[PDB]
Design a protein around this nucleic acid. Structure first.
Ligand SMILES: [Mg+2]
Lengths: 582, 757, 124, 283
DNA sequence: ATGAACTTCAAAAAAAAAAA
C-alpha cells in the first residue's frame, strides 16, 4: 500500500490532467536547454532557471526518463536527448575526458540510433547533425551563459531545436512516440511477472527509478542492492517484482510530489501528502460541480499540510476528517529512501498528535487575552529563547520539541530547563512558558517520567497540594497583591524575588510574606485585601512547608502554578466568587 | 438595536445603523451589484455579511469602541458564514461563507491562512450567540430565507452546465466584491451619515464622486475625436484614423475578448478608449478600465484622457498617488477604492492583484471589473510568471462576465491560445482573440517609427567601453542596459565629452521623473534648435516604461523583444524626426542578469541566430518572442491557478485557497528590500514644500532652463505617523537586493547623483 | 491544612501570630495597622523582638473583644499554640522563617473557617 | 607566571550587612537554603578584589575589565587594535588578544574572563578561582525594614504630602563565610599571572573588605587567608585534605555566632610540610 | 568465478500566527 497508493495516484494525476510524466518520461529539471537549428548549428544555450532562492536547475521539462546510469561504465547509458554537460558536449567539469567523451561517444550514439530509427524529424536529424559536428558543440562552450552551466555540476543540457520554441527535440511527436514506443517494447520483454504493486503480469522492473527530492541525489526509493538485502537470490528489484509500468508510475509519483506542493517537512522528514480516492462527491454537491467532481490527487492536501503547519501557525482546528490523506513521510537514509511515515488515515487521525500537543499545551487565558488559543510553536519556543526564536537549540529544542509535538512524544527535559531558565530570567512566566511547561509536565506525567504528580489542567487547580505548584500559586497571589497594592511597580516581587522563589522557596517565601501584610494593608479596597489574603490562606493551606529547594519538576509547577493563579486572579470575578463560597 | 454601526455624529450626537436595515440595504445593494451572476446569490451573503454583528458581545463592543451609550475586537464575520454553511448547502454554504467570513478579514482560505474550516468550526459558539441575538428581539424568522432552491437559480442561471472548479474562485472574489463593496458603501454611507448608498443618500454628488458614463461619451470623446482629426492631415491621422475607424468598427462585433495591435504613436491611448467607449455604449458595459504595468504611462494616459474627457478620469498610481487633498483627492480617490467610476485608469498590479485579491480593501473592485471593458496597455508586460492565472481569469471574465479585455500594447501579449506541450494545456489562455487592427503586420510596417539593427548573428559581444565609443559617435543616444549594475558600468565608461544621464532602479521615483523630464527638454532643445553638447542617456528598464522620450537613436542591450519594443517606442517617439529613427540592439557584456530578463535575451538571440527576426519590430516576430517566452518560465508561478482551483470534497467542499493565492499573487516581485535615499527633488521657494512630481517636466523647466545649476531642497521623514504624508516616503525609494546590503555600516548619503551604491 | 501539633517553632509562632492578629482584628476590626502590618516582619524573623510585646499587647485585645467568651475562645488557642512554643526563638531559622508565614496563614484559615475554633475549643 | 600552585582558605565575615544579596531573592544575602548557611558568590569576592586592584594599582597591566560604563566588547576591541590588528591571523588573533587582555587587565590575568564576545579576544580561564563562600554557620539574615522619608518618581508620591518608601535592608547579623580558592599554575602559564599579580591578589583578599563598604555590606572583614603553597606546579596534597586543616567551628558554647570571637579557626599545619608551605597571610 | 573494492552515478532541501 506504500506504492499501490503511489501507483494509484499516478493513475489519478495522469487522468486528472495534472501533467504527470506519461509512461516513458520524467519532469527532469533541465537547467541549460540547448537551442539548435534544423541542421545542427548551435543557436543558443538558454537557461530555464530562476526559481526559489537556491536557483533550482531548470524548468521541469517532461523529457525521456533518466536511465539510472550509476556505474563504472556509466558512459554507455546515455539518456535519450537530454543528458548532461558531460554527455552533450563531452565537457567534463570534474570527471575528466574519456569519462565525458565516452559519455558523448554514447550520447551521440544514442541520438544517432534514434535518428536511424526515427528519420525525417528535423529535430533529431538536427541534433544528430549537431552531435556529428564537434565544432558547434565547441561553440556551446563559447556561449554567453555557458560559464553558469559549468558552475552547476551535473548540468542537464537538452537540445531544443529552433522553430519549435517551447518543444524540445525530445518533445516532438516522434520522439514522444519513440519513447512511448521505447517504453512499450524494450521495457516489456523483461522478466515477465509478477507485479508487487498492481499484481498484473506487467514485466518486472529491476532498477526502480531514482526518486528525486529525498536524498542529496535521486535515489531509487525501492532498491535492494547489497549482497544481502537480496532475499531469495532475487538480485535487486526482483526481490520486489514491481512491473515496469508500475515502477515507473510510483517513481514518477514520488518525483512529482517531491517536486510539487505535496512535499512538506513534517519535521526534518520530507513528506508527500495526497488525497486518497475522494468519495463519489454526493449528488447534491456534485450537481453544482461540473463534470462532475474530479479526484485531483493532491487536492485537499492542505487539510493535512495546514495541520502540521498549524503547529507553527498556531491555527490548529480540531478536524473532522473521513477524507483520508495518504501521507508518505519518506526521508533519506544515505541514498535509499526511508519511509518514516505512512498514513492512509484521515487528517483527524493525523491530528491526534498535534491535538494532544495543543491540548497538553492548553493554558488559561482571560478575556481579550493577547495570547492565541493554540499558541504557535515558533512563538511558543520564543518564550524559551534568549530574546528571539532562533537560538533555541536546533537539536534538543525547536527541531525536537516539534518532533515531541508532531508525534505526542515527551517534551525534552530541555523545556523545564529552558522554560524555567526564561521564567526566572525574564522574571515572569509568559503564557508560552506556562503553557509549554504545562505541556512538558503533562507529558512527563503521561510518560511516567514525573511519577507522583498528576497532570496539569487548563485552569488553576485550587487543589494540587504540590509543594511547587502551590508555591507558584502563592507567588502569583503575592505578586498580584503587590501589583494590586502598588499598581505601577518597577520591581514587582516577580522581578525581585522570582528567581529564588521558583527554585528556592525558603530563601524567599519567608520574606515575600513579610512584604505581604504591608501589601494587603496598602490595598485601597480593604475587602480586596481580605479576599487576596483569604486566597493566599487557601493556597498556603496546601503548603505544609516552603521547600528548601524546588526540584526541576516543581519549578515547572511553580511557573505553571504562578500562571494558573495569576490568571485566576485576573479572571472576571474568580477570587471574589471563590472567597464568597467560603 | 441591533447597532450595526455606531457613528458619533459631527454634532456630538450618535446615530445608530440598525443592523436590520444594514443587512437589508447591503443585500439589496449587492443584488444590483451582481448582474445575472449572483444577483439573489450575493445578497444571501449580503443579508448575512454582518450576522455576527448581532452578537450580544459585539453589541457591547461597537458601543464601547465607537462610543455609543458609552476594547475587545469581537469577531463577527465568521458567525454569518457558519449560519450559511449550516443552512443552505455544504457547497453553497461554504461558497457563501468565503464571502461572509471574509467580508472584513479579507477572503479566506479553507485550510492554509485564515482558514475558514477553522473559523467555521470555531464559529459554532459565535454563531449561537449571534443567532440568539438575531432571534432575540426583532428580525422576523423569515428575514434570512436562504432559500437554497431559489439560490440554486442564480448559481445555475450563471453556471450553465455546472460550476467550473478552476474558476469558481472568481465569484468567490467577484461576489465577494459585491458584498464588500455593499458593506463598505453602506458602512461609509453611515460613517458619513446618509443612511443609504444606492438611493440618492450616497448617490448624491457630495458622497462618492459620481461621474458621467455614457452621455459624456457623445459629448467629450466625440469632442476630442473631432478636435484631433481636424487638427492635422499628414502621414499620421491618415493611419491614426485608420486605427480608430476599425477600432470603432471592431466595437460592433461580439468577440468578448479583443486586442489592439497598434505601435507607439498610432493612437494607442486614443483609440483603445475609442474602441472601449464604443463597445461600452453598445454592449451595456458600465465601466472602462485601463490597466498599465507601470505608473508612468499612467500619467501619459491621465493627461490624454482628461484632455479628452475633462475630470471624470479616476486613477490610482498605487505608487505615486500625489498628496494633493481637499475633495479633488479623497473624494475622487474615494471613488477608486472600488472603481465605482466609468473610466478608471490604474495599473494592472492594482487591477490583477486586486482582481485576484483576498484582502477586504483590494477586493471591492471585482464588482466593477465585471461588466466593464478592461483595457491592458503595455499588456505585453503581464508577468509570464503569473500569466496562467491572469489569462484564465481574464478569459473567464471575457467568457461570462461581460467584459472585454483589450490588449492595446504595442506588439501583443501571446496570452496563449493553447500552448500545450504533451497533451496538457499549459496556459489555457484567451480563445480566438481579435486583432482589432485589420492588418496587424503591415500597419506596424506602415507605422514603423524606427528601423532596427540587431547585433551580428554570431556570438560576439560588444564591450562596455566599445558601446560607449559607439554611442559617443552619435548624439542623443538612449542606451538601455539590462541591469542597474550594467547602468553603473556604462556610466563609468562614457566620456565626459557629452552629458551622460544615468537611470537605474538605484534611484528614486521622484528623482527618476526629474531625470526623464530633463531628458525630455534636452530632446526638445535637440529638435527645436540644437544642443551642441553631445546627448545620451544610460538607462535600465525605467525608460522602458513608456516614458515620453523622442530619442533619434537608441542602443538597447540584448534582451527580450518585449523590451526591444519598449526601447523602439522611445526612439522616434511621436515622429517629427527625419525618415526613421535608429534603434540598435547590442549584445552587451554578460547581459540580462537572471529571471525573465535572461530568458528575454536567450529568446531574442535564439531568433536572430536562427533566421527569425527578419524585422524585429514586426508583430509576427513579437508573437514569436512571446510564444517562446511563455513556455520558457513556469507560466504559472508559485501555484496560483492551482490554489484557486476549487477543490470540492463531501467533507470540505469548495476549499479554495484565497489568502494563500492572494499573498502568493505578487506581480511586483519586490525581492529584497527598499531603501529610501533622500534626493532633494526641487522647490518653488514660496514656502516650497511642492515635491512637484508631475509638473517637473513643464513648470520647473519653463521657469528655470536646462542649464544644470538648479538648487532646491525638500527634506522629509518627520518620523510622525500622521496617517498620511506617506508618498513623500516610498515615492522616493530604491530597491537593492539582499545581496547588495551586506557589502555596504548603513553609510547613508552614499547614493550619488547618478545612482546608489 | 493546619498541623495543630506540628511543634515546628516557626510554625507554632506563625499560628500564634495568626491568632494574635485575629484577636487584634476582632478587638477593633477597624484597624489601620494590625500586628501583621506593624509586627509581622520581625515576628516572622525575630520572634523575641515582638512576641514579648505582642503579649503585653494581647490581654488588652482580649479585653477589647466585644464577645467576652470569644476572648476565652482565642486565648485558649493561644495557649494551645504556646504549649508547642517552649521559647520564642531569638532568630527564626530559615526553615522556621518560612514556616512562620505558613503558620500565620494556616492558623488564620483555621480561625476564619467558620466553626473550627468554637468547635475545637469545645473538645477541651 | 607562578611556579607553585596555591589553595587558600579565605575566611571573611560580615558583621551587620548583606555580604552578597541574591538578586533572585530580593536582595537578601545568598544562602545555602537547605542548610541556611550564607553564600557569597565567587564573583562577589572576585569583584571586590577587582575593586581593590582598580583602587590601588591605577596603572596599565592591572586594569580590571571594569565598572558600569564597562562595555566589555569595547575593551576586547581595544585588544584587536594592538600589535595583533592583522598580524595575528584570525585563528591566533584571539590568542594574541588573550595574551593582551591578560597583560593589561589584572582581572583577566588573575580571574578569567569570557571575552570571546566582541572582536573575539579568546577565553581566559583565570588562575585564581575563588569558590562560593559558604558561611560556617547559618547566617540569620535579619532583613531590617528601614524607612526613607523620600520617594522616587512622582507616581509613588503620596496622595498627601507624606512621601516615604520604607524599603528593606537585609543584614547578616554575623556570618563567617569561608571561601576556598585555587591559584592554578597551569592557567597562570596561560595568562602570565605572576607572583607579583599573586601578591597583589593576596593583598586584595586581605584588604578587599576594608575598601568595599556599602550601606548593604555594613561591616565585612577578612578574618583569615591561609594559603597552602604547594612545592610543585602540581598539588603536593589534595586540595580538600588541605582545606580540612583550616577547620572553622563555632566556639564551645555559642548558640549561634555574632562575631569572629564566636568562631575558633583551628589551623592544622602539623604535617602539611611534607613538601609544602602554609602561609597564614590573613589570619 | 564470486565478492570485496571501487567507480561511477547526482549535484538537496528550507517555514511559521494578527483582529475584524
Ligand atoms: Mg461588516
Amino acid at each position: 500500500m506504500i506504492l499501490h497508493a503511489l501507483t494509484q495516484y499516478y493513475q489519478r494525476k495522469a487522468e486528472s490532467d495534472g501533467g504527470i510524466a506519461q509512461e516513458g518520461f520524467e519532469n527532469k529539471e533541465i537547467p541549460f536547454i540547448i537551442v539548435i537549428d534544423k541542421q545542427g548549428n548551435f543557436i543558443q544555450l538558454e537557461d530555464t532557471r530562476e526559481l526559489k532562492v537556491k536557483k533550482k536547475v531548470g524548468r521541469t521539462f517532461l523529457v525521456p526518463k533518466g536511465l539510472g546510469r550509476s556505474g563504472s561504465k556509466s558512459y554507455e547509458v546515455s539518456n535519450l536527448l537530454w543528458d548532461h554537460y558531460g554527455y552533450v558536449l563531452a565537457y567534463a567539469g570534474e570527471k575528466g575526458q574519456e569519462q565525458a567523451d565516452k559519455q558523448h561517444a554514447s550520447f551521440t550514439a544514442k541520438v544517432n540510433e534514434l535518428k536511424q530509427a526515427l528519420p525525417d524529424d528535423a529535430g533529431v536529424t538536427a541534433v544528430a547533425a549537431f552531435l556529428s559536428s564537434a565544432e558547434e558543440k565547441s561553440k556551446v562552450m563559447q556561449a554567453a551563459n555557458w560559464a553558469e552551466c559549468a558552475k552547476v555540476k551535473g548540468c542537464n543540457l537538452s537540445f531544443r531545436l529552433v522553430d519549435e520554441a517551447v518543444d524540445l527535440v525530445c518533445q516532438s511527436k516522434a520522439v514522444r512516440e519513440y519513447v512511448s514506443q521505447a517504453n512499450q517494447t524494450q521495457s516489456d520483454n523483461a522478466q515477465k511477472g509478477i507485479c508487487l504493486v498492481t499484481g498484473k503480469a506487467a514485466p518486472i522492473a529491476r532498477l526502480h527509478n531514482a526518486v528525486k527530492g529525498v536524498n542529496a541525489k535521486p535515489a531509487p526509493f525501492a532498491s535492494v542492492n547489497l549482497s544481502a538485502f537480496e532475499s531469495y537470490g532475487k538480485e535487486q528489484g526482483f526481490a520486489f517484482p514491481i512491473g515496469e509500468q508500475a515502477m515507473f508510475e510510483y517513481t514518477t509519483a514520488l518525483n512529482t510530489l517531491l517536486a510539487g506542493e505535496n512535499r512538506f517537512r513534517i519535521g526534518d522528514v520530507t513528506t508527500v501528502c495526497w488525497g486518497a480516492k475522494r468519495t463519489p462527491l454526493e449528488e447534491s454537491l456534485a450537481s453544482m460541480i461540473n463534470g462532475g467532481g474530479k479526484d485531483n490527487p493532491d487536492a485537499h492536501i492542505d487539510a493535512v499540510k495546514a495541520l502540521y503547519k498549524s503547529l507553527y501557525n498556531g491555527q490548529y482546528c480540531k478536524p473532522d476528517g473521513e477524507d483520508k490523506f495518504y501521507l508518505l513521510g519518506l526521508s533519506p537514509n544515505s541514498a535509499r529512501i526511508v519511509v518514516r511515515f505512512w498514513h492512509e488515515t484521515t487528517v483527524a487521525a493525523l491530528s491526534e498528535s498535534i491535538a494532544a500537543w495543543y491540548d497538553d499545551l492548553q493554558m488559561v487565558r482571560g478575556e481579550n487575552s493577547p495570547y492565541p488559543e493554540y499558541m504557535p510553536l515558533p512563538r511558543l519556543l520564543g518564550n524559551l529563547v534568549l530574546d528571539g526564536k532562533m537560538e533555541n537549540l536546533p537539536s534538543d529544542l525547536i527541531a525536537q520539541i516539534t518532533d515531541a509535538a508532531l508525534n505526542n512524544r515527551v517534551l525534552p527535559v530541555s523545556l523545564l530547563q529552558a522554560a524555567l531558565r526564561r521564567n526566572k530570567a525574564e522574571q515572569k512566566i509568559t503564557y508560552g512558558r506556562a503553557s509549554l511547561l504545562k505541556a512538558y509536565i503533562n507529558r512527563a506525567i503521561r510518560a511516567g517520567r514525573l511519577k507522583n504528580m498528576k497532570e496539569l489542567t487548563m485552569g488553576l487547580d485550587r487543589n494540587r497540594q504540590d509543594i511547587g505548584y502551590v508555591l507558584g500559586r502563592l507567588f502569583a497571589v503575592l505578586e498580584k497583591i503587590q501589583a494590586e497594592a502598588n499598581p505601577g511597580l518597577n520591581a514587582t516581587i516577580a522581578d525581585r524575588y522570582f528567581g529564588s522563589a521558583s527554585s528556592t522557596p525558603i530563601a524567599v517565601f519567608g520574606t515575600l510574606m513579610r512584604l505581604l501584610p504591608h501589601h494587603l494593608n496598602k490595598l485601597e479596597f480593604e475587602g480586596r485585601a481580605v479576599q487576596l489574603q483569604w486566597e493566599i490562606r487557601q493556597i498556603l493551606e496546601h503548603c505544609q512547608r516552603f521547600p528548601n529547594h524546588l526540584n526541576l519538576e516543581q519549578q515547572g509547577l511553580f511557573a505553571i502554578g504562578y500562571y494558573h493563579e495569576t490568571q485566576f486572579l485576573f479572571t472576571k470575578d474568580a477570587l471574589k466568587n471563590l472567597f464568597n463560597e467560603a | 438595536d441591533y447597532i450595526a454601526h455606531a457613528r458619533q455624529d459631527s454634532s456630538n450626537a450618535w446615530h445608530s445603523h440598525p443592523l436590520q436595515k444594514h443587512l437589508q440595504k447591503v443585500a439589496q445593494l449587492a443584488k444590483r451589484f451582481a448582474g445575472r451572476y449572483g444577483s439573489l446569490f450575493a445578497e444571501y451573503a449580503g443579508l448575512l455579511h454582518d450576522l455576527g454583528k448581532f452578537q450580544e458581545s459585539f453589541q457591547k463592543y461597537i458601543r464601547n469602541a465607537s462610543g455609543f451609550e458609552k476594547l475587545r475586537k469581537i469577531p463577527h464575520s465568521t458567525a454569518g458564514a457558519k449560519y450559511a454553511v449550516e443552512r443552505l448547502n455544504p457547497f453553497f454554504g461554504h461558497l457563501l461563507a468565503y464571502l461572509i467570513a471574509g467580508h472584513h478579514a479579507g477572503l479566506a482560505d479553507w485550510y492554509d491562512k485564515g482558514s475558514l474550516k477553522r473559523r467555521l468550526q470555531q464559529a459554532d459558539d459565535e454563531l449561537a450567540a449571534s443567532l440568539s441575538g438575531f432571534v432575540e428581539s426583532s428580525l422576523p424568522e423569515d428575514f434570512f430565507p436562504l432559500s437554497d432552491d431559489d439560490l440554486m437559480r442564480d448559481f445555475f442561471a450563471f453556471w450553465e452546465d455546472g460550476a467550473k472548479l478552476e474558476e469558481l474562485h472568481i465569484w468567490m472574489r467577484f461576489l465577494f466584491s459585491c458584498l464588500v463593496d455593499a458593506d463598505f458603501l453602506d458602512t461609509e454611507a453611515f460613517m458619513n451619515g446618509y443612511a443609504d448608498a444606492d438611493a440618492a443618500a450616497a448617490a448624491a454628488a457630495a458622497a462618492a464622486a459620481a461621474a458621467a458614463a455614457a452621455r459624456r461619451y457623445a459629448e467629450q470623446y466625440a469632442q476630442l475625436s473631432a478636435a484631433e482629426d481636424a487638427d492635422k492631415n499628414s502621414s499620421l491621422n491618415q493611419e491614426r484614423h485608420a486605427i480608430l475607424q476599425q477600432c470603432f468598427s471592431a466595437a460592433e462585433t461580439d468577440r468578448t475578448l479583443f486586442s489592439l495591435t497598434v505601435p507607439t504613436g498610432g493612437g494607442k491611448t486614443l483609440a483603445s478608449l475609442g474602441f472601449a467607449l464604443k463597445h461600452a455604449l453598445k454592449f451595456g458595459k458600465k465601466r472602462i478600465i485601463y490597466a498599465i504595468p507601470f505608473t508612468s504611462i499612467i500619467e501619459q494616459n491621465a493627461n490624454v484622457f482628461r484632455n479628452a474627457l475633462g475630470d471624470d478620469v479616476v486613477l490610482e498610481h498605487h505608487s505615486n498617488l500625489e498628496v494633493k487633498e481637499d475633495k479633488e483627492t479623497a473624494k475622487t480617490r474615494l471613488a477608486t477604492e472600488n472603481w465605482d467610476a466609468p473610466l478608471i485608469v490604474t495599473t494592472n498590479v492594482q487591477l490583477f492583484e486586486s482582481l485576484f485579491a483576498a484582502k477586504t480593501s483590494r477586493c471591492r473592485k471585482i464588482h466593477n471589473i465585471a461588466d466593464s471593458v478592461v483595457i491592458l496597455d503595455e499588456a505585453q508586460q503581464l508577468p509570464r510568471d503569473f500569466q496562467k492565472p491572469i489569462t484564465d481569469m481574464m478569459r473567464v471574465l471575457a467568457r461570462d462576465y461581460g467584459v472585454t479585455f483589450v490588449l492595446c500594447t504595442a506588439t501583443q501579449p501571446e496570452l496563449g491560445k493553447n500552448i500545450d506541450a504533451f497533451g496538457r494545456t499549459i496556459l489555457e489562455g484567451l480563445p480566438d482573440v481579435r486583432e482589432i487592427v485589420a492588418d496587424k503586420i503591415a500597419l506596424s510596417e506602415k507605422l514603423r517609427r524606427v528601423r532596427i539593427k540587431m547585433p551580428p548573428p554570431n556570438g560576439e559581444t560588444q564591450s562596455w567601453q566599445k558601446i560607449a565609443d559607439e554611442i559617443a559617435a552619435r548624439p542623443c543616444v538612449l542606451a538601455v542596459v539590462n541591469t542597474r549594475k550594467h547602468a553603473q558600468k556604462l556610466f563609468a565608461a562614457l566620456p565626459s565629452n557629452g552629458i551622460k544621464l544615468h537611470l537605474s532602479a538605484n534611484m528614486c521615483a521622484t528623482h527618476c521623473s526629474e531625470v526623464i523630464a530633463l531628458v525630455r527638454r534636452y530632446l526638445a532643445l535637440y529638435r527645436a534648435g540644437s544642443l551642441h553638447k553631445p546627448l545620451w542617456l544610460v538607462s535600465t528598464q525605467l525608460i522602458e516604461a513608456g516614458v515620453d522620450l523622442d530619442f533619434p537613436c537608441v542602443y538597447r542591450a540584448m534582451a527580450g523583444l518585449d523590451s526591444i519594443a519598449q526601447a523602439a517606442g522611445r526612439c522616434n517617439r511621436e515622429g517629427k524626426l527625419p525618415q526613421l529613427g535608429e534603434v540598435v540592439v547590442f549584445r552587451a557584456e554578460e547581459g540580462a542578469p537572471s529571471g525573465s530578463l535572461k530568458q528575454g535575451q536567450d529568446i531574442t538571440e535564439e531568433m536572430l541566430k536562427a533566421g527569425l527576426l527578419d524585422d524585429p519590430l514586426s508583430p509576427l516576430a513579437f508573437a514569436e518572442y512571446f510564444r517562446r517566452f511563455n513556455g520558457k518560465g513556469d507560466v504559472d508561478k508559485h501555484d496560483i491557478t492551482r490554489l484557486l482551483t476549487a477543490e470540492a470534497s463531501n467533507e470540505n467542499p469548495l476549499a479554495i485557497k484565497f489568502r494563500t493565492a492572494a499573498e502568493r499573487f505578487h506581480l511586483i516581485d519586490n525581492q529584497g528590500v527598499a531603501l529610501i535615499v533622500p534626493f532633494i527633488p526641487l522647490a518653488h521657494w514660496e514656502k516650497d514644500g511642492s515635491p512637484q512630481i508631475v509638473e517637473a517636466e513643464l513648470d520647473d523647466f519653463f521657469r528655470r532652463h536646462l542649464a544644470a545649476a538648479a538648487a532646491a531642497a525638500a527634506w522629509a521623514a518627520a518620523a510622525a505617523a500622521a496617517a498620511a504624508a506617506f508618498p513623500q516616503p516610498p515615492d522616493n525609494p530604491d530597491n537593492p537586493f539582499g545581496t547588495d546590503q551586506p557589502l555596504l555600516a548603513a553609510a547613508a548619503a552614499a547614493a550619488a547623483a547618478a545612482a546608489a551604491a | 491544612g493546619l498541623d495543630r501539633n506540628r511543634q515546628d517553632i516557626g510554625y507554632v509562632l506563625g499560628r500564634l501570630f495568626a491568632v494574635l492578629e485575629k484577636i487584634q482584628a476582632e478587638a477593633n476590626p477597624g484597624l489601620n495597622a494590625t500586628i501583621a502590618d506593624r509586627y509581622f516582619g520581625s515576628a516572622s524573623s525575630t520572634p523575641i523582638a515582638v512576641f514579648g510585646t505582642l503579649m503585653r499587647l494581647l490581654p488588652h485585645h482580649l479585653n477589647k473583644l466585644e464577645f467576652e467568651g470569644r476572648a476565652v475562645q482565642l486565648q485558649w488557642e493561644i495557649r494551645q499554640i504556646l504549649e508547642h512554643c517552649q521559647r520564642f526563638p531569638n532568630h527564626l531559622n530559615l526553615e522556621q522563617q518560612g514556616l512562620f508565614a505558613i503558620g500565620y496563614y494556616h492558623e488564620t484559615q483555621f480561625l476564619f473557617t467558620k466553626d473550627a475554633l468554637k468547635n475545637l475549643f469545645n473538645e477541651a | 607566571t607562578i611556579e607553585k600552585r596555591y589553595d587558600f582558605v579565605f575566611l571573611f565575615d560580615v558583621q551587620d550587612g548583606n555580604p552578597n544579596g541574591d538578586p533572585d531573592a530580593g536582595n537578601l544575602p545568598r544562602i545555602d537554603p537547605q542548610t541556611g548557611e550564607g553564600l557569597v558568590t565567587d564573583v562577589c569576592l572576585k569583584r571586590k578584589v577587582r575593586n581593590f586592584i582598580q583602587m590601588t594599582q591605577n596603572d596599565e597591566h592591572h586594569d580590571i575589565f571594569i565598572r558600569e560604563k564597562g562595555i566589555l566588547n569595547n575593551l576586547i576591541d581595544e585588544a584587536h587594535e594592538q600589535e595583533n590588528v592583522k598580524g595575528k591571523e584570525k585563528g591566533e588573533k584571539t590568542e594574541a588578544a588573550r595574551q593582551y587582555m591578560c597583560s593589561r587587565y589584572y582581572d583577566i590575568r588573575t580571574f578569567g574572563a569570557v571575552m570571546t564576545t566582541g572582536k573575539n579576544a579568546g577565553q581566559v580561564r583565570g588562575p585564581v578561582q575563588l569558590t562560593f563562600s559558604r558561611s560556617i554557620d547559618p547566617i540569620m539574615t535579619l532583613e531590617h525594614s528601614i524607612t526613607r522619608m523620600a520617594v522616587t518618581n512622582e507616581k509613588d508620591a503620596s496622595e498627601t504630602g507624606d512621601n516615604r518608601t520604607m524599603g528593606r535592608k537585609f543584614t547578616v547579623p554575623y556570618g563567617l563565610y569561608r571561601c576556598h580558592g585555587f591559584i592554578s599554575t597551569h592557567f597562570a602559564k596561560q595568562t602570565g599571572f605572576s607572583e607579583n599579580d599573586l601578591e597583589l591578589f593576596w593583598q586584595a583578599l586581605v584588604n578587599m573588605f576594608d575598601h568595599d563598604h556599602s550601606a548593604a555590606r555594613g561591616q565585612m572583614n577578612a578574618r583569615g587567608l591561609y594559603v597552602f603553597e604547594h612545592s610543585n606546579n602540581l598539588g603536593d596534597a589534595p586540595a580538600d585534605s588541605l582545606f580540612k586543616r583550616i577547620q572553622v567551628v563555632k566556639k564551645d558554647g555559642v548558640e549561634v555566632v555574632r562575631s569572629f570571637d564566636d568562631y575558633l579557626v583551628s589551623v592544622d599545619d602539623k604535617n602539611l610540610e611534607e613538601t609544602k608551605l602554609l602561609r597564614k597571610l590573613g589570619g
